[PDB]
């Protein structure tokens, strides 16, 4: 749904500049949220295997 | 004899390969997945005019981007067991059909895709140690 919304938003934004451009696709790659410093969702996964 | 030249384009079933890249499932678990795609040239005129010279690198980049997008969109749905149980079974076929099918088609560029496979699934270090 974010892929759906961002495309229409950008197309509506680029209208007045009148650049004459057509957008083929709007692709969305990985969205890692750990900020590379809070890589401690590892323990939140390692909770199961220790309780059992 | 001297006004023109012509370009020879391969037609064999070409093979694209890559390296590992991470993912995520809804259980917050994360995997490692590697794959490869079989691609064939559908219509030669559109291909040559579009890709700009017909050397493999740009076609590789296009397919790489589009494949990463569609796969990562798909695996994000199903659960951790559902990867390992049947990762071929409906993942590969569904993503093939969706990727192969106007603009945004990946065929509009002039490329035909044969089939898609998954090669290996590992786990991160800490979870491996725990199990």
Curated annotation (Swiss-Prot), chain A:
Superkingdom, natural source: Bacteria
Note: Integration of this protein into the membrane depends on SecA, SecY and SecD but not on SecB or FtsY. HflK is unstable in the absence of HflC.
Protein name: Modulator of FtsH protease HflK
Compartmental location: Cell inner membrane
The organism of origin for this protein: Escherichia coli (strain K12)
Function description: HflC and HflK help govern the stability of phage lambda cII protein, and thereby control the lysogenization frequency of phage lambda. HflKC inhibits the SecY-degrading activity of FtsH, possibly helping quality control of integral membrane proteins.
Subunit description: HflC and HflK interact to form a complex, originally called HflA, now called HflKC. HflKC interacts with FtsH; complex formation is stimulated by ATP, and with YccA.
Similarity comment text for this entry: Belongs to the band 7/mec-2 family. HflK subfamily.
Curated annotation (Swiss-Prot), chain B:
Top-level lineage group: Bacteria
Effect of residue 89 to A: In hflC9; stabilizes overproduced SecY but not overproduced cII protein
Subcellular location: Cell inner membrane
Note: Integration of this protein into the membrane depends on SecA, SecY and SecD but not on SecB or FtsY. HflC is unstable in the absence of HflK.
Family label: Belongs to the band 7/mec-2 family. HflC subfamily.
Protein task: HflC and HflK help govern the stability of phage lambda cII protein, and thereby control the lysogenization frequency of phage lambda. HflKC inhibits the SecY-degrading activity of FtsH, possibly helping quality control of integral membrane proteins.
Oligomeric form and interacting partners: HflC and HflK interact to form a complex, originally called HflA, now called HflKC. HflKC interacts with FtsH; complex formation is stimulated by ATP, and with YccA.
Protein name: Modulator of FtsH protease HflC
Naturally occurring in which organism (per UniProt): Escherichia coli (strain K12)
Protein's gene: hflC
Full-length numbering of the shown residues: 57 to 223 of 334
